[PDB]
């Protein structure tokens, strides 16, 4: 049972984010098991239509996750110092 745009339309905005995160999380965790919760949280700031696109396009998701990891790691370097 895949997530569809009509499924999401049945839900309040905050629930839609959670629904999107549920589908994204296993994919993100596969790529980066340690950072997965934080990375998913970061991506959930993106508009829901764009998140749907990311769910449909592995290349798009991977580029965004790469961006998120690089940002998180750069931030961590600043805080670690």
């Amino acid at each position: 049972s895949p997530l569809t745009a009509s499924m999401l339309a049945s839900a309040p905005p905050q629930e839609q984010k959670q629904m999107l995160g549920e589908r994204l999380f296993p994919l993100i965790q596969a790529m980066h098991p340690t950072l997965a919760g934080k990375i998913t949280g970061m991506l959930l700031e993106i508009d829901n239509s764009e998140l749907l696109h990311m769910l449909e396009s592995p290349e798009s998701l991977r580029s965004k996750v790469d961006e998120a990891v690089a940002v998180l790691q750069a931030h961590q370097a600043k805080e670690a110092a």
Partner: peptide, 16 residues
């Protein structure tokens, strides 16, 4: 753009 201070996401399960 992406904010590294974003709320962490909590899944229904990790076996996801």
């Amino acid at each position: 753009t992406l904010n590294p201070n974003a709320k962490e996401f909590n899944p229904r399960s990790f076996s996801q």
